[PDB]
Amino acid sequence: ATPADWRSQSIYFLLTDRFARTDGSTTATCNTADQKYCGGTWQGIIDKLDYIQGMGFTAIWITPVTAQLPQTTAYGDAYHGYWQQDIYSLNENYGTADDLKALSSALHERGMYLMVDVVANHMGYDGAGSSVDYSVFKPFSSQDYFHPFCLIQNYEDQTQVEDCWLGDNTVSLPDLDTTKDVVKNEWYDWVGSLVSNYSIDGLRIDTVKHVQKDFWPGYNKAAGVYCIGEVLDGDPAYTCPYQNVMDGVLNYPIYYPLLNAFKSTSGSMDDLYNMINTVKSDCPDSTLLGTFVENHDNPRFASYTNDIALAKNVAAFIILNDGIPIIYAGQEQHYAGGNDPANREATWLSGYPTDSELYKLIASANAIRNYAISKDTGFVTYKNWPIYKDDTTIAMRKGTDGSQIVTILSNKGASGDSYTLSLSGAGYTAGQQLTEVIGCTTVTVGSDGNVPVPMAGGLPRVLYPTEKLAGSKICS
Ligand SMILES: *[C@@H]1O[C@H](CO)[C@@H](O)[C@H](O)[C@H]1NC(C)=O
Ligand SMILES: [Ca+2]
Numbered sequence: 001a002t003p004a005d006w007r008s009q010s011i012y013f014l015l016t017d018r019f020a021r022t023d024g025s026t027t028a029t030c031n032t033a034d035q036k037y038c039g040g041t042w043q044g045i046i047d048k049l050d051y052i053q054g055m056g057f058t059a060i061w062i063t064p065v066t067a068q069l070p071q072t073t074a075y076g077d078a079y080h081g082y083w084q085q086d087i088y089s090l091n092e093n094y095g096t097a098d099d100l101k102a103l104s105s106a107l108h109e110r111g112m113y114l115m116v117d118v119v120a121n122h123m124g125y126d127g128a129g130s131s132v133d134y135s136v137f138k139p140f141s142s143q144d145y146f147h148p149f150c151l152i153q154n155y156e157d158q159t160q161v162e163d164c165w166l167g168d169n170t171v172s173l174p175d176l177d178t179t180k181d182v183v184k185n186e187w188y189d190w191v192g193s194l195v196s197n198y199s200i201d202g203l204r205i206d207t208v209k210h211v212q213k214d215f216w217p218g219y220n221k222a223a224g225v226y227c228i229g230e231v232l233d234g235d236p237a238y239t240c241p242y243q244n245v246m247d248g249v250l251n252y253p254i255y256y257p258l259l260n261a262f263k264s265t266s267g268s269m270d271d272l273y274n275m276i277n278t279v280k281s282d283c284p285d286s287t288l289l290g291t292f293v294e295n296h297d298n299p300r301f302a303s304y305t306n307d308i309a310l311a312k313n314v315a316a317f318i319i320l321n322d323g324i325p326i327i328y329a330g331q332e333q334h335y336a337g338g339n340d341p342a343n344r345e346a347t348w349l350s351g352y353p354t355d356s357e358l359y360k361l362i363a364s365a366n367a368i369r370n371y372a373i374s375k376d377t378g379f380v381t382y383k384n385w386p387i388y389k390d391d392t393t394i395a396m397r398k399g400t401d402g403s404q405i406v407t408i409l410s411n412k413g414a415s416g417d418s419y420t421l422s423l424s425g426a427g428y429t430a431g432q433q434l435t436e437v438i439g440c441t442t443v444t445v446g447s448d449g450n451v452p453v454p455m456a457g458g459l460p461r462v463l464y465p466t467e468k469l470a471g472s473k474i475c476s
Contacts, residue, residue, distance in 0.1 A: 001113055001201040003247045003288055006059075006226040006324060007380040008373045009113055010366050012052045013061040013204075014329035015296060016094045017079040018346045020044030030346035032337065035076020038346050042099040046106045051352045055332060055359060056366025059113035061204050065100060066119075067091050071126035073171045076341065080296065081117065082206060083124025083171065086138040087190060097197075104199045113201035115228075116194070120187050120219065121207040122166055122173035129165060129172045140176060145183060147175040152210075155233075162212050178215045187215075188222035195223055202226040208242060208249070209233065216245040228290050228324070232297070236275070240283035248288035251323060253279055258293050261394070262314040263304040265413045269389045276396070280322065280383050287381055289323040294331045300343050302336035309414040309458035312361045316438070316460040319365035320398060320407050322384040332358045361438065361460075367474050368405060368437045368464055375468060376403040387425040392416075393455075395423055403468050406434075408453050408461040416458030423451040426463075433466040440475035442466060 017040040021028055024047055030038035045060070052060060067089035068078030078084075081091065090097055104114045123140065125132045129149040135141045150164040166173040176183050194200065208216065208229035220227045228248040231239040236253035243249055257275045261267040280286050293314045294301050301311055311334060319325045330337075333350040334357070337343040353359065373379045378400040387406075388395040395408045406426045410416060428434065432445045438460055445451050453461055469475065 001225055003226045006113070006202055006248075007287055008370075009059045009324050010057050010319065010369065011059045011061050011115060011290065011324055011326045012055070012057040012329060013292075013295065013326050014045070014347065015063050015080060015344055016040050016042065016045070016065075017063070018344055019329050020048045020348055022047075022095075024348075026348050026351045028346070028348065030349060032341045032344050035079070035341045036072060037077050037079045037093050040094070040346070042095040042103045046103055048352065049106060049110060049112075051354060053110055053112065054354055055327075055362045056370055057327070058111070058370070059115055059201070060107065061115040061117060061326070062103075064117045064119055064206070065090055065094065069124045069126055073126045075171050078124060080344070082119055083173070084119060085123055085125070085136055088138055100198055108199065114199070115202040115204055116198070116200050117204045117206060118191065118194070119206040120176070120178065120215070121210045122175050125172045125174060127172060128169045129174075132172050132174055134174070137174070139186060140183075145176060145180070147177050162210055166207065166210060175210075178211045184215060184218060188218055191219060192222040192224060195225055200225065202228065204250075205229045205246065208246065213242070213245045216242075220246050228288075236279055236283055240279065243284040243288065248285075248290060248323070250326070251279070251289040251291050253283075254289075254291060254321070255293060255298075258314065258317060259301070259304070262293075262310045262317075262409075262411050263301065264310075265392070265411055267411045269391065269394045269411070273386045273389045273394055276321075276384065276386050286322040286383060290326045291318045291321040291323050292326040292328065293318055294328040295326075296328065296343055297340065298343070299338040300328075300335050301331065302334050303338045303343075306334070306336065307413045307458075308334070308357050309416065310411060311358055312438075313409045313411065313458070313460045315358060315361055316365050316407060316462060317409055319362065319369055320384070320396070320405060320462065322398070325366070325369075327362060332356065332362050334358055364438050364474070365462060368462060371469070371472055371474060372399060372403065372405055372464060376400045379403070379405075388423055393421065395426075397426055401427055403465065404428075406451065406463040408455070408463075410455065410458045410460065412455075412458035414458055416456065418454070418456040421453040421455050422446075423453050424449070426451050428465070434463040435466045435469050435475055437462050437464060437469070437474055
């Protein structure tokens with residue numbers, strides 16, 4: 001699927017090993033501290049697609065699929081998929097090729113997209129760099145395919161970042177020499193064949209900043225689908241230019257201020273407002289970025305605060321910001337694990353309740369976004385516009401005039417007081433009736449064009465014209 005196709009999507013990102021087991025058990029042990037395979041499979045995903053689609057997600061992103069190093073290293077097993085050794089074999093822990101094809105088929109039967117995580121930068125090896133036996137890598141079974149062994153010491157030295165090997169010296173990540181035509185050709189052929197083999201609709205590309213930029217346009221082209229790159233850096237002046245060589249990047253610039261704004265009742269709305277505006281104006285296309293506040297490489301949101309209202313506001317922002325929402329499996333069950341490995345909790349241990357607080361919030365937010373998009377072909381290309389902020393509030397507007405969603409977010413938390421915010425600049429006509437879709441209530445725009453937004457319990461408010469909602473099952 002093209003970048004234009006992907007703009008409307010909403011992604012549930014999951015770890016294959018940790019989302020669902022073939023036997024569907026909700027009690028199977030998964031102690032994250034052990035850092036061992038817990039048994040999640042591709043077949044498990046298929047069996048739980050109703051759970052994912054009931055939240056209004058239109059796509060999944062799954063961790064890498066290639067065969068991994070076999071060892072339990074000092075840092076655990078390769079359950080996460082980022083330590084590949086044989087790119088022409090699948091990771092048997094997750095199932096067979098027929099299972100992976102069955103997963104893409106099942107998603108397509110539901111009108112959903114499959115996004116697969118891929119690594120081009122490195123292989124993986126249990127041991128120090130000097131102990132690597134290059135003959136275990138397929139097809140790159142020789143030192144000649146790799147950069148000389150060095151480590152990345154200074155992330156301001158872009159040559160080091162690209163040419164040196166990742167990690168400390170415990171589990172080596174041999175760095176492929178992606179400047180060699182033999183490596184480009186192999187990777188390009190591989191990725192095109194992967195996408196075709198398995199009818200993949202888009203790719204998430206790992207470790208993008210660690211490969212020189214001239215590699216990525218050909219890789220994205222060979223893939224034939226939308227590619228969103230992991231460029232792990234909060235500085236938009238560094239990260240957003242990667243959109244000149246790839247369709248999209250993960251919105252790490254927004255990540256850091258977004259977390260700070262909502263992780264406590266003293267978070268800075270100013271910093272989030274400012275970063276929204278910087279990304280919107282300076283990044284090549286904010287509507288092709290992926291918005292997130294939770295993933296497998298940072299502490300989960302609830303590790304910072306268990307306040308359910310703060311979690312609802314950040315989840316609402318992720319769904320209604322420019323670009324593609326990305327929710328990390330477990331976020332909807334208020335998982336609270338800290339840094340790796342603690343943030344790789346097994347989703348099945350929640351019991352997959354479809355009535356949890358954040359399941360419902362996410363279902364409502366995706367519902368209105370999916371509905372609004374189906375009625376407004378300009379929603380996804382209308383750049384989100386922050387229209388108001390104060391010490392505890394940020395309000396934003398997105399969508400064509402007459403059909404815009406106006407979202408009011410708050411960091412007052414669950415004990416927030418009850419008051420009315422007179423919101424100016426929402427662009428609705430006087431007397432427009434609006435539905436607040438999270439709580440299924442109504443507000444009418446005042447004669448002065450201001451919206452009287454009831455605020456209470458620090459809850460997010462998502463407004464959309466009642467006429468436009470018409471006879472949808474949202475708030476029926
Ligand atoms: C694509 O399918 C062919 C089977 O005709 C297989 O040989 C090839 O390795 C596959 N490529 C990938 C990347 O899976
Ligand atoms: Ca590299």
